[PDB]
Amino acid sequence: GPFNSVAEAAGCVATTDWMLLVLLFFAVLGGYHVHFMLTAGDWDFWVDWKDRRMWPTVLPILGVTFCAASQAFWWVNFRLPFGAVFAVLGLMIGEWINRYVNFWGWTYFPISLVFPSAMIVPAIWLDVILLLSGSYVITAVVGSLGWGLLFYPNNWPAIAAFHQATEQHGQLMTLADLIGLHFVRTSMPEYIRMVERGTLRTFGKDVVPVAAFFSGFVSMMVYFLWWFMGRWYSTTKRIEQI
Amino acid sequence: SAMIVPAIWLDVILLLSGSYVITAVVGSLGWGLLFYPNNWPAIAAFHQATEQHGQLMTLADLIGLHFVRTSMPEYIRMVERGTLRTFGKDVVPVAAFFSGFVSMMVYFLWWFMGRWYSTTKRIEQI
Amino acid sequence: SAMIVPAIWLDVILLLSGSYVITAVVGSLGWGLLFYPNNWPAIAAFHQATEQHGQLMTLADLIGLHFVRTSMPEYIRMVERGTLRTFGKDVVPVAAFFSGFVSMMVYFLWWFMGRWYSTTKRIEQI
Amino acid sequence: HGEKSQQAFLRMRTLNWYDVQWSKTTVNVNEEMILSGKVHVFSAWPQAVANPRVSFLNAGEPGPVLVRTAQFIGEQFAPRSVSLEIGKDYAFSINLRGRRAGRWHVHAQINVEGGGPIIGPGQWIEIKGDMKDFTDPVTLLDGSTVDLENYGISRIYAWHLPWLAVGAAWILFWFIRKGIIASYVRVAEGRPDDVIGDDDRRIGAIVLALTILATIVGYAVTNSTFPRTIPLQAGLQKPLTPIETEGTVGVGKEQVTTELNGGVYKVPGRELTINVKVKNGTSQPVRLGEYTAAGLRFLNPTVFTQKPDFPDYLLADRGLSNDDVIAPGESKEIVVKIQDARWDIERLSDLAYDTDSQVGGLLFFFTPDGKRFAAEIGGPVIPKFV
Amino acid sequence: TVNVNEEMILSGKVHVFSAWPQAVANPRVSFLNAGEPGPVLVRTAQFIGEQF
Amino acid sequence: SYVRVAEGRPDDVIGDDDRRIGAIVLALTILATIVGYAVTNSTFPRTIPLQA
Amino acid sequence: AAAAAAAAAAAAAAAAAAA
Amino acid sequence: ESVVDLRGMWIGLAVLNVFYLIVRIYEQVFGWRAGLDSFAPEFQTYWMSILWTEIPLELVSGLGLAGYLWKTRDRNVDAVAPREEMRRLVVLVQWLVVYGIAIYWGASFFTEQDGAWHMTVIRDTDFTPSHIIEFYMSYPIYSVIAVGAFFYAKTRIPYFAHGYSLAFLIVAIGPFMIIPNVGWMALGVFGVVLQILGRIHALIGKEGVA
Ligand code: CUA
Ligand SMILES: [Zn+2]
Ligand SMILES: [Zn+2]
Ligand SMILES: [Zn+2]
């Protein structure tokens, strides 16, 4: 090479590989997290915001953004089939470190109040749909429909304990409502929430299923857009003037 | 809604001056202006007045009330209901001129849309 | 409103560093910040207080009330009316900072618009 | 804390706090106290603040140092938002439970929807003991009891941590089985295909199929535990019951009435002087005993000879005066002088910085026996500089 | 039971519930109607409040 | 100037001392602003916001 | 107290004296 | 010679990570009984002392680092031996890893940290402990480090000299566009690593070895 041997060449390739994986992980984490935090909020922060309609709607839609851009980077230039999981794991880690170290460690809110939304499972569907058909178009459609659909059921195991019922002073509450009332937040009045509150235009029984489908279909568009964003952020252009 | 007449105006303004630019302006202004008049002959019979229990109604309103739709409450409508900032007598003329002027922009944009939908490009990757 | 002063800061930041990127950032943050203080000398006489019929008014309010405009009801205004989320005492400083930061984005975009308006392209078809 | 920095006129002309008490100022971990009080919704509610039609009662405190066990307002358990009517009065109370050892400033607080926080009076509560000893607990419908402090948390980790781990394994796998630079080069050179081709796809198809299976199983298993569940309970509560006793602004045959007729506050910054046109209303001679503004109490030492249990901070023993029993049916105009440092310290003096130079609050009038009769005061006041 | 062209009145009373839910906008702005599958009967007038 | 930029590089258009003039002009500007601001707080030392 | 300009001045300087 | 060093990286990593750990411990301790009431004198001695101090320190560190990398720039950059270019760009990748970590602390840790604090106080001030660390320390730090990576590349690697990498521009400047209340993001590290890879690819014609 510009290398003194083959040993120096191999040693270089392997350790630049690590450094790139670690810098890219934490670079994507940063962007994803700020974006997600500012938009998906709010629903991710609090157990009593994780309702049947809003949460399983805004979350997959705002969450697919960085998964698509990460796939756009990892698949186009390397054929590595982990762009979604890469992004999604980063978000989880950034989130979980914070909930434990800060939400709880600093401000003593119990983890049952502040745990994040589960996303690895839909991220996987997203990544292997791209792997099986090296098509972003097929992924943008069927991949990101499965992303939507899978969101709620993959959260259910973490969430359901808190949807057990309690009677408090003659009025029904979920445990989640209770954890919200008990562990007092200074600026979280029940009404800033943005959770399902009923409508005359609901028939069934069908609240979560339609939210799931809605999120799938909307994510397609967001996926399309954010793929191309990942492309443009991939740019190797030099510009000459500033 | 009756649309063939303005559609014709639009087509022959393009024919007479093979310019989409002159069309986007004077063509689509005519598109606007012309709308109401070309509907007036189908519409006017329903704007004759009736009195129903003490209260004025058009025939249109009346065909509305009579032929019951399950989800069309009079308030979902979005029709003119009056304003303090109306002077005249000029309701239809300004709406016509408004729709002419705004259509120009929409026409410019959609012309190019037509061009992009006309694309003969091949892409290589999916 | 007084504007030469923030315009000068903007112009010479670009002069000293032939960068529109530096200007976009610091040039236009000065723009923001400098706005109000460069306006104060012209504006302050009218922020003197007066008691009218048991009630506090600025001379500016009074000039508004006195010199009757037909279509300027106090309410159409869009001026600060207070909020429970103000702490301080800090109203003009955060306004200035906010303006400076948002102007960066605006400046970026509008620089490129200036570039696009600058275009020397011929197009062949109309 | 912090209410000191909110605008004075907003603090004065929204919620007029009174009879706020704290039951215990010292509690062990797990021990209860009630924070209770009353609130009058000012009748000239400011434009800046959305209608209190949508509101939430709260314990103003630095995080959950005390856990809220119940709370009431109107005459109603209120875990959800409530409607306060303009010009009416509400009783409230909060049940709090010691959680973190320390010394904590705990306020009554109500938040209005397009409004923000309005902070009522607060008192220092010492909490002693060990947070390790904190328990709830809480009774489920099915009869069991959980400790909300720890409940459900392991089950969250048991689901979140394995997936976080499976996530990492999927990344490491591909990274290590034909890597970053080696793959950049391959793609950039000839085709990939030397990067991906079945059996790479087969692994993927397998992994996906196990994923979906694990998701289905986890879903069915969690329906077997927990087979009856409800959605989060949300929405505004039925209208509240105001205080009818007895009284009590704008209630009953016996009233006091107070029109404000101009006032002067020195800038800076310790005195407010106001002209009040009083109408008695009642069938007893009444003396002015109190002005309350933003939680603050300005007492008349003629009426409050000595001298209530109430926060620091807060309690001012000079809202003099002129002693002259206002007579039954009488109608008189009296000069009131509010003077105390607490006017400056709680920054009510910073009224000259607001866009509405105007006072608000309640005046309390007392009979020769017990009875308190309350009137709302409010209106324009002029600053006098230095 | 009615022949084509024959009238009937559908009538009743309604009490608006005082704890009106938040999910539903204020009944300040409302419309009376005959729930029916299309115009199988033609509505000839209606009243509520004490008002056509 | 159009010609100069269009031809070779500018630099025959702008280079210190051109920048110097500018740095001077800016510094005087900020001074005149600070002065006028201070002088106007000397007249008019107590002021209020628009009452609304 | 003044781990303001302490750990920060010291973090900046252990860096500059490694050039 | 060794094309791979890494000492500089571990120094930057240890120094940066222990510093933020000190900052986290410092806020656990002085967050309570110092940071809850911004009108108290304790707020001046424990929180505003940081703020008034860190801004000039970061500003001098930023201009000082750039100015240094420019004075010590390679005036003879087009002449760089393939091997030394390989080294210099392993060093760029070092800078970028430190920046990776800086971004994590600044945009994930302390940003979401502000989330919990908003539920703890009612705010006397714009300058809460959360904000002092997040907006006035944590962000400028990685902003500085980013400008350093950019300047290092502009001054050591022919390619990043004469040009301005559009992606690297977005990386250095993007931070100066972070503002909250009351998608265009930085992630252009994508383009930057592709440019590096573009360059590593070219520094070997006999690459059947991979
Ligand atoms: Cu002020 Cu607690
Ligand atoms: Zn325990
Ligand atoms: Zn060169
Ligand atoms: Zn914040």
DSSP string covering H17-42, please?
HHHHHHHHHHHHHHHTTTSS-TTSHH
> D282 and D241 share a domain?
no
Pair D347, D4: CB distance under 8 Å: yes
Residue D228: which CATH number? 1.10.287.710
Domain hosting D378: range is: 251-386
| Closest CB from H32, H123, H200 relative to D181 | H200
**Cα–Cα distance for residue pair D362/H128, rounded to 1 Å:** 34
Separation of CA H92 from chain center: 13
- Which tokens sit at E30? 């409302």
What phi, psi does D259 have (nearest 5°)?
Answer: -95, 140
3-class DSSP state of C24: helix
Closest listed residue to residue A161, CA positions, set D156, H180, H93: D156
Pair B47, B117: CB distance under 8 Å: no
Q: Is residue D122 within 6 Å of ligand 1 at its C-beta? A: yes
Placement of tokens 């990544």 in the chain: A127
Q: Is H61 exposed, middle or buried (0-12, 13-18, 19+ CB in 10 A)?
A: buried
Tell me the torsion sign for CA atoms A31, A32, A36, A39.
positive
- Which tokens sit at A109? 């809110």
Exposure on the CB side of residue F1, measured as CA atoms within 13 A? 2
Q: Which ligand has the nearest atom to the CA of H80?
A: 3
Placement of tokens 């809605």 in the chain: A214
> D4 and D96 share a domain?
yes
Pair D288, D363: CB distance under 8 Å: yes
H160-to-A237, H164, H165 alpha-carbon distances in Å: 11, 6, 6
Kindly list the partner chains of chain E, i.e. chains with 3 or more CB atom pairs below 8 Å. Answer: A, B, D
Q: Which ligand has the nearest atom to the CA of D136?
A: 2
Pair C81, D47: CB distance under 8 Å: yes
Tell me the torsion sign for CA atoms B87, B92, B93, B98.
positive
> D256 and D361 share a domain?
yes
C126: which chain B residues are within 8 Å (Cβ-Cβ)? 19-22
Pair A121, A128: CB distance under 8 Å: no
What phi, psi does D382 have (nearest 5°)?
Answer: -105, 140
Pair D52, D115: CB distance under 8 Å: yes
Placement of tokens 């976080």 in the chain: D164
Placement of tokens 């959605």 in the chain: D231
> D129 and D210 share a domain?
no
Residue D69: which CATH number? 2.60.120.570
**Cα–Cα distance for residue pair A33/H108, rounded to 1 Å:** 6
Exposure on the CB side of residue H119, measured as CA atoms within 13 A? 25
Identify the H or E element spanning A165: strand A165-168
3-class DSSP state of C22: helix
D356: which chain F residues are within 8 Å (Cβ-Cβ)? 51-52
B122 Cβ neighbours under 8 A, 6+ residues apart? none
D206 Cβ neighbours under 8 A, 6+ residues apart? none
Query: What was the elucidation method?
Result: X-ray
**Cα–Cα distance for residue pair D345/D356, rounded to 1 Å:** 20
Placement of tokens 């940063």 in the chain: A30
Q: At what angle do helices H166-173 and H189-202 cross, to 10 degrees?
A: 140
3-class DSSP state of C84: coil
> D292 and D345 share a domain?
yes
Instruction: Give me the DSSP letters along chain H.
Output: --S---HHHHHHHHHHHHHHHHHHHHHHHHHTTTSS-TTSHHHIIIIIHHHHHHHHHHHHHHHHHHHHHHHT--TT-TT--HHHHHHHHHHHHHHHHHHHHHHIIIIIIHHHHHHHHTTT---SSS--HHHHHIIIIIHHHHHHHHHHHHHHHHHHSBTTBTT-BHHHHHHHHGGGG--------S-THHHHHHHHHHHHHHT-S-GGG-
Instruction: Give me the DSSP letters along B67-87.
Output: S--TT--TTS-------TT--
**Cα–Cα distance for residue pair D306/F17, rounded to 1 Å:** 78
What phi, psi does D326 have (nearest 5°)?
Answer: -70, 125
Q: Is F38 exposed, middle or buried (0-12, 13-18, 19+ CB in 10 A)?
A: exposed
DSSP state letter for C101: H
Core vs surface per residue A98-125: b (16+ CB within 10 A) or e = bbebbbbebbbbbbbbbbbbbbbbbbbb
3-class DSSP state of C76: coil
D307 Cβ neighbours under 8 A, 6+ residues apart? D299, D301, D317
Q: At what angle do helices G7-16 and H7-31 cross, to 10 degrees?
A: 180
**Cα–Cα distance for residue pair H36/A177, rounded to 1 Å:** 27
Separation of CA C70 from chain center: 26
Identify the H or E element spanning F8: none
β-pair partners for D36: D21, D93
A130-to-A87, A90, B123, B125, D195 alpha-carbon distances in Å: 15, 20, 18, 13, 14
Pair E2, E8: CB distance under 8 Å: yes
**Cα–Cα distance for residue pair G4/G8, rounded to 1 Å:** 6
Identify the H or E element spanning A132: helix A120-132
Pair A206, D95: CB distance under 8 Å: no
Using alpha carbons only, what angle is made at residue H181 by residues H178 and H187, rounded to the nearest 5 degrees? Answer: 25
Say how many domains are in chain D. 3
Using alpha carbons only, what angle is made at residue D119 by residues D118 and D121, rounded to the nearest 5 degrees? Answer: 145
Q: In chain A, how many H helices and how many E strands?
A: 10, 2
Using alpha carbons only, what angle is made at residue D303 by residues D299 and D305, rounded to the nearest 5 degrees? Answer: 90
Pair D75, D240: CB distance under 8 Å: yes
Exposure on the CB side of residue D50, measured as CA atoms within 13 A? 12
Q: Is H112 exposed, middle or buried (0-12, 13-18, 19+ CB in 10 A)?
A: buried
Closest listed residue to residue A228, CA positions, set A65, A82, A35, A34: A65
Q: Is A37 exposed, middle or buried (0-12, 13-18, 19+ CB in 10 A)?
A: buried
**Residues making up the binding site of H:** 78, 114, 118, 131, 162
> D258 and D316 share a domain?
yes
Whether residues D5 and H197 touch (CB distance < 8 A) is answered with no
The C-alpha R_g of chain D, in whole angstroms, comes to 30
Look at residues D217, D250, D283 and tell me which one is the last residue of a structural domain.
Answer: D250
CA B68 – ligand 1 centroid, Å: 61
HEC string of D214-278 equals HHHHHHHHHHHCCCCCCCCCCCCCCCCCCCCCCCCCCCCCCCCEEEEEEEEEEECCCEEEEEEEE
**Cα–Cα distance for residue pair H189/A28, rounded to 1 Å:** 9
Placement of tokens 């001012």 in the chain: D316
Q: Is D253 exposed, middle or buried (0-12, 13-18, 19+ CB in 10 A)?
A: exposed
Long-range contacts of C44-48 (CB under 8 A, 24+ apart): C44/F40, C44/F41, C44/F43, C44/F44, C44/F47, C45/F44, C47/F44, C47/F47, C47/F48, C47/F49, C47/F50, C48/F44, C48/F47, C48/F48
> D26 and D90 share a domain?
yes
State the virtual CA torsion across C107, C111, C113, C119 in degrees, nearest 10: 170
CA H161 – ligand 3 centroid, Å: 7
HEC string of chain D equals CCHHHCCHHHHHCCEEEEEEECCCCEEECCCEEEEEEEEEECCCCCCCCCCCCCEEEEEECCCCCEEEEEEEECCEECCCCECCCCCCEEEEEEEEEECCCEEEEEEEEEEECCCEEEEEEEEEEEEECCHHHCCCCEEECCCCEECCCCCCHHHHHHHHHHHHHHHHHHHHHHHHCCCCHHHHHHHHCCCCCCCCCCCHHHHHHHHHHHHHHHHHHHHHHHHHCCCCCCCCCCCCCCCCCCCCCCCCCCCCCCCCEEEEEEEEEEECCCEEEEEEEEECCCCCCEEEEEEECCCCEEECCCCCCCCCCCCCCCEECCCCCCCCCECCCCEEEEEEEEECHHHHHCCHHHHHHCCCCEEEEEEEEECCCCCEEEEEEEEECEEEEC
**Cα–Cα distance for residue pair D233/A175, rounded to 1 Å:** 10
**Cα–Cα distance for residue pair G8/H58, rounded to 1 Å:** 9
Residue D260: which CATH number? 2.60.40.1580
The two beta strands, D315-316 and D297-299, are parallel
Q: At what angle do helices H82-103 and A6-39 cross, to 10 degrees?
A: 30
Pair B101, B32: CB distance under 8 Å: yes
**Cα–Cα distance for residue pair C49/C60, rounded to 1 Å:** 9
- Which tokens sit at D52? 């209190």
Closest listed residue to residue A23, CA positions, set D44, D98, H102, F40: H102
Q: What is the separation, in whole angstroms, between the first and last Cα of chain B?
A: 42
β-pair partners for A172: A167
What phi, psi does A235 have (nearest 5°)?
Answer: -50, 135
Q: Is C101 exposed, middle or buried (0-12, 13-18, 19+ CB in 10 A)?
A: middle
* Structural domains of chain H in order of their starting residue, each with its CATH number: 1-210 (1.20.1050.50)
Pair A148, A212: CB distance under 8 Å: yes
Closest listed residue to residue H193, CA positions, set A235, D5, D248: A235
Look at residues D191, D222, D250 and tell me which one is the last residue of a structural domain.
Answer: D250
**Cα–Cα distance for residue pair B63/B43, rounded to 1 Å:** 13
Using alpha carbons only, what angle is made at residue D259 by residues D255 and D265, rounded to the nearest 5 degrees? Answer: 130
Q: Is residue D1 within 6 Å of ligand 1 at its C-beta? A: yes
The two beta strands, D26-28 and D116-128, are parallel
**Cα–Cα distance for residue pair C70/C67, rounded to 1 Å:** 10
**Cα–Cα distance for residue pair H161/H192, rounded to 1 Å:** 14
> D208 and D300 share a domain?
no
Cis preceding-peptide flag for D132 (omega within 30 of 0): no
Pair D124, D105: CB distance under 8 Å: yes
> D114 and D143 share a domain?
no
Whether residues A242 and H3 touch (CB distance < 8 A) is answered with no
3-class DSSP state of A45: coil
Pair A163, D222: CB distance under 8 Å: no
| Closest CB from A29, A38, A107 relative to H104 | A29
- Which tokens sit at D27? 């509690």
Closest listed residue to residue A64, CA positions, set A2, A181, A143: A143
What phi, psi does A89 have (nearest 5°)?
Answer: -65, -45
A137: which chain B residues are within 8 Å (Cβ-Cβ)? 126
Nearest residue of A to residue D117, measured between CA atoms: A187
**Cα–Cα distance for residue pair H71/H74, rounded to 1 Å:** 9
Look at residues D250, D282, D313 and tell me which one is the last residue of a structural domain.
Answer: D250
E24: which chain A residues are within 8 Å (Cβ-Cβ)? 198-200
Using alpha carbons only, what angle is made at residue A50 by residues A44 and A53, rounded to the nearest 5 degrees? Answer: 115
> D322 and D189 share a domain?
no
> D354 and D313 share a domain?
yes
Nearest residue of F to residue D267, measured between CA atoms: F46
- Which tokens sit at C100? 């400076």
Farthest-apart Cα atoms in chain C, separation: 72
3-class DSSP state of E19: coil
> D173 and D262 share a domain?
no
**Cα–Cα distance for residue pair D10/D354, rounded to 1 Å:** 9
Closest listed residue to residue A30, CA positions, set H24, H141, H106: H106
- Which tokens sit at E29? 């702005």
Q: Give resolution in angstroms.
A: 2.7
Neighbours of A214 (CB within 10 A): 16
**Cα–Cα distance for residue pair A136/A123, rounded to 1 Å:** 14
What phi, psi does A225 have (nearest 5°)?
Answer: -65, -45
β-pair partners for H107: none
Q: Is residue D107 within 6 Å of ligand 1 at its C-beta? A: yes
β-pair partners for D102: D127
Q: At what angle do helices C28-43 and C4-16 cross, to 10 degrees?
A: 150
Whether residues C83 and D116 touch (CB distance < 8 A) is answered with yes
Neighbours of D306 (CB within 10 A): 7
State the virtual CA torsion across D10, D14, D15, D16 in degrees, nearest 10: 80
**Cα–Cα distance for residue pair D161/D153, rounded to 1 Å:** 12
* Structural domains of chain A in order of their starting residue, each with its CATH number: 1-242 (1.20.1450.10)
Pair B54, E52: CB distance under 8 Å: yes
**Cα–Cα distance for residue pair D373/D279, rounded to 1 Å:** 12
